[PDB]
Design a protein around this ligand. Sequence first.
Ligand code: FES
Lengths: 401, 58, 55, 49, 145, 51, 79, 234, 184, 49, 19
Amino acid sequence: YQRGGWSPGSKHQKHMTLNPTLYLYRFPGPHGPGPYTMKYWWTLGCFPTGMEVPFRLHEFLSTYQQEHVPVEVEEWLRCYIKDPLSELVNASNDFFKAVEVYPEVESARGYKTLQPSIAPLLVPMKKFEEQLGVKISPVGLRSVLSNPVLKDRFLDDLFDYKSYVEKGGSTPHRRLARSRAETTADDERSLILLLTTISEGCINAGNYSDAASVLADALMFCHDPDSQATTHANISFASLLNADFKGAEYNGREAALLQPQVKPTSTACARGYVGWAAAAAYQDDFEKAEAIVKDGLTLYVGNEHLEKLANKLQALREEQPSVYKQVPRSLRESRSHLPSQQSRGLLSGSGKGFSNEFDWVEFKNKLYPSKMDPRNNEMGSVFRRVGDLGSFISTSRSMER
Amino acid sequence: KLYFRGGKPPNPSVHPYLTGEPCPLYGWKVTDESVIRQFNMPSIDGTNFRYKPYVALQ
Amino acid sequence: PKRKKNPMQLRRKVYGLHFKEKYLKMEEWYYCPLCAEPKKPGEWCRREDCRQIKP
Amino acid sequence: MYARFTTRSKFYFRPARPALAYNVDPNVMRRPKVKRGLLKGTYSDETVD
Amino acid sequence: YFAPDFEISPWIWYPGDIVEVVSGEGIGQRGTIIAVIKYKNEIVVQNINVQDVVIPASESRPEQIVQREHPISVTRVRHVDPSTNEICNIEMVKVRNKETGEMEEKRMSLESGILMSIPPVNDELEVGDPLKDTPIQDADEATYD
Amino acid sequence: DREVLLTGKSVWECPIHIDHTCGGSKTVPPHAKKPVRYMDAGIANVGVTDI
Amino acid sequence: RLRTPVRDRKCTLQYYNPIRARFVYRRDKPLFDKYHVTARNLAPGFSRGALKHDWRALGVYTPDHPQVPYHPLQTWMLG
Amino acid sequence: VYGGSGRGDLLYENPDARRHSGRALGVLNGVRHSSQATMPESGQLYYRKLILHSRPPNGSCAGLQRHCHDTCNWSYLIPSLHRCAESAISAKLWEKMCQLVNLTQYERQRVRDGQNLYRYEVHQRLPLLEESIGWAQLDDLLGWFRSARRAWVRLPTSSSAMSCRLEGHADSRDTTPGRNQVFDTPERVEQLTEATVHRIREELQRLNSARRLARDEELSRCVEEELGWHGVAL
Amino acid sequence: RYAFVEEEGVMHKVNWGLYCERLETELTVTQERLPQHTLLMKAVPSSWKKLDIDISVIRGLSLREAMAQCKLSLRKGHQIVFRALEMAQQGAEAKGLDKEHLRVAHISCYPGPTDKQIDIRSKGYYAWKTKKSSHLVLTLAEDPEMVLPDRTCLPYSSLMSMKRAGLSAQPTVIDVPAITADGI
Amino acid sequence: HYRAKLELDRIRSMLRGRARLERKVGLKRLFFLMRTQTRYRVEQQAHWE
Amino acid sequence: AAAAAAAAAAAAAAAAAAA
RNA sequence: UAUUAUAGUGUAUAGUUUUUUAAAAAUAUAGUUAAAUAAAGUAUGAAUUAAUAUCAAAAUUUUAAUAAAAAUUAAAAAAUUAAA
RNA sequence: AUUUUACCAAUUAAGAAGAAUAUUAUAAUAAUGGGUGUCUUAUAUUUUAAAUAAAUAUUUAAAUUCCGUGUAGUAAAUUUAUUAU
Ligand code: FES
């Protein structure tokens, strides 16, 4: 009968006569509540046995006491918020100091020296991002600092930004206040250049999504037509590398539309045309890509990028006779060829045995078992077993439902 | 079942005071009318309407 | 159910081959040319292109 | 071909750690206050429960 | 502090006094008692125990960090006699005020014989509900025969 | 406690009445009164302040 | 040994694997709807469709069966 | 010395003494002979080697597979000293001292403790700094001088704490090999100061836009003021 | 309170509080500066014995192959390891480490909390089923010298099926000029 | 009854598996080993040498 | 389990009828 | 949340709606004479038992009762399933 | 071109009031059955009897008896007294 200890936590078997017990469905163990008992705690509000006494005093202290604030304090805190301009100036100062004191990488021979970790740059980066409403990529900053030329092209831009802000210029804040028209200022241009450098570092690292986000923020900041064209071209290239063909095409079209507002010396228009053509090629519309390349050549004859893309399209056209036509409209996008696409598939791909349409199905905001999926009444669906609720037969078949 | 056919038991210590007896003709014939409470407010008056539930602070 | 076992007596199973085949196997895979997801040969998706042509 | 695996004596036999007499750590007054996890080598940049 | 008779009986500590911290984080630093929590036996002295007070963000405002002096255990601090400007033991004393001719309780410094009154408490008085507040005159009107 | 920490106001009495008997006072008859006790065993009444 | 390189197994699709070799000559018409190919799993000149084993122009004597010329493979096909 | 404090480690650990333990040792992992049950022969070089090498890798040491930390890097050693000085002396006290001898006894003792801790940390880090002189950086050397200034210790360029060697008769000092003891601490620190001054000069010579102009100006002004405070020129 | 430290061959007294705070600060900052991200998942819904097997399978692999194997496996341990790898990858991305060079430098589990469930048995007997949980430690370091196998290769069957469909066996690589700020 | 508990737990590290992990098994094995070695030394080692 | 599944299904049907 | 309708009264067309899985042994059900159902594996996870060193191929001989206790002789691989 | 054999290893410093109006004995002064969220109604809520018992006794003799189952006022209202958040 009795083999182990008398306590419920004992392992081996017991008997009703010797050690009578209550029906405890599931209770914690000697080492504290487990994930299952904690799931019961969060869902039912108490452990499944019910003999336990709920005690969430610590949770109450963490949430409700912390978020409680009287009306007067809540009203005066907004008025006593810090000074945005001074806070931004201090953030820029400390960020520049940290970047300057960041050590330079030793160029070892025979192997690649590990780039020193950026511990002290995060907090200055966090405050700078908060102040400017922008989001800087830590990977991009790491790559920029590791590269020597990019490091200088970032430090000079940051110093110019600091100088122009200290001189009393806050272009975003002034524009927002006025809106509550003019062209880009020196401070805004320096900020855009800094963000473009960060995006270039992101591209060198391989973080095309971060590069695209940084360039999008730079575009948001910019207002000059030339800056808009250049930023649109950069965003188109970043989206092409990130496997965002719709975004790349949209940015390229916007750059090509802004073409007239830009002076002849700039190449942003040609870059936008190249990006649009590349997006079309990746979407597998070779006729559209060729037409766009022809238009770009007619606009800027002799552009190196346009010539290279035209040569590549000519090679693809020479290969096409093997197929006797273009890719059929049926698929028109099926093939995937980018490392960004491969990484996305590896991350968000439906794994075998989990994260698939048979493991869990995500409803509006909730997880459901495959049987309860409202997107299909398959043979494993509960919806199949319902039928003829009482209104009408609703189906000709007479065996189930 | 009478006086209990559910889950929540009655509390006889808070039941309304008995006031009469049954009769098949009318229903419940009331005998002890004094048991029933009538909340007759005092008549209106000047100081009465000038008074307010709370007292001001000097 | 007659006597306790020692660590080596328990490790005999990992010495064996059935344990390795059941637990210590590595799957060979590749990136699908269409969806660019990890994929094992012989198994495909329910997408129309995958059904029509099976990578 | 196959992954190296070795049954763990830690799982085979895990006796409970010594308790405290009168809730007293014998060498609290002799040791530094540094985190024993840090001084043993266990560290986590992001603890998830 | 839920335990019976947890408070201090004499309770010499009142707001506006000058005290010096004798134990804890800050030792030797003196200041004025900004506030007092009697049921906890705690004191709040300006620029003594300053700690950040985070405020979770809401739909109208973001998170904001604010610093306020936190309560300090009563036993930590000791009163300072203004005349001596040093640490002096204090004791509750009773005196019949000349003006009103009635007994009252003050706190006396043993070392120097200094007397300190009890600062009266006058909470906010700007509140009021004239619609449902009985006027003082009508409230005081006596009609009981 | 949080309101005091924020507003800096002082509190002179507990915000909630505390019943240290948890109903024992209710169980005790209303007219209860401890009896007198003479010649008790305690040096507290001496008033020493040096030992 | 301080830290040996990652255990990532070299590409093995083009080597000989019996499970895949079992499908080289297996009828598969139902599998395909709109894109049928002749002996899909069969690579001419290779042992059971294993591109790592090439016998295209080595001189293996098959008097009653056909073979194909040797066109050198490519890195993106081998791995 | 393997499993315990090593070359540049700050924690002091006597491996033979079972300090920092809640249990009386019952099993000795490094055992060569059954006689060591009652005659462990600890202290003898070979048996102590066996025991210490059998000890597991603590937080100071690192396993053969875990990635170690470049503790011997000057760019890490200098900020370590700066952080030591910052912790020893609070920002408020540092500002008060810079503005200003009228100080509280607690503050004076805090400053003395900070100076003592900084001297001990310099003693512990000296071999690593000496090894890392060659591939250091001008910013990190300027940071070395700044950290010394913040700790309030005046380096012996030839208050002051490095100039006086620690007391103790030479016949009782721990001369045991394998422990990174620096008996000639003032001389070694003076040599390190001269070496870093020369390294700063060489870096400036090698170095010889608005951002870079401002950087050069601020660097020169710093170098000048810090060297003047420490009693050095050029 | 003073702490004794061996300096110049003699024991010297230093402020114990400063000594301890300095030691802990140095340990924490050294661990942070180490170019790796460590993650700890507590109360994993898997017995430590079973989870150790999947941990040993995934041990000593690059992040890419670890994720691929976990997604292609059908084990609770492998799914848990995939979740842990995703969290650790996000942490490394936030910390600034290069994704393409990530590798697993440590994967181990130890017993964690343990719930118990009553299982009725005939003849009036009963016991307590044990619901086990594990604590998973996952360290992602960076190995710049790491070289990954080329998994883009696909079977000849797939190649010729794509050729029949009209697709291109090779990817349609298009040169992408690097972003520039010349126009600004 | 006296047994070499403390004296043998010290060298308990020289055994394998269960004996090295569990105090009782290791102590029993070490006691047996010591006794057998004593007997061999006092009655056969000299003859063999 | 073979006959047990059918027995459980019949019991469930009876319980649904009696509910 | 189990074999299992608690049936008093009372009625007869309300479809009154939760039982995995790609073989085999064993086990249970199922034109001589007097062929169905229950798998491994994914997942969960008990119970009797537990002196035991990484263990006790085998034969021969013997010692105080089964004697893998002893000695001699001899030559006993690992994992998995089944078989008393 | 290709590739790193099989097997074998170990428990320790503890992060935070996750330990006190605590556990046991101890007070020779109280006492009509303690029962809070209680809250009429008293034909219906009665426990008493000369005994070893919530009252509890300072020694070895003699002595009935088939194993002797055993010792007196110490002071007379005198302080050995059933105590107590
Ligand atoms: S795209 Fe990979 S399986 Fe279909």
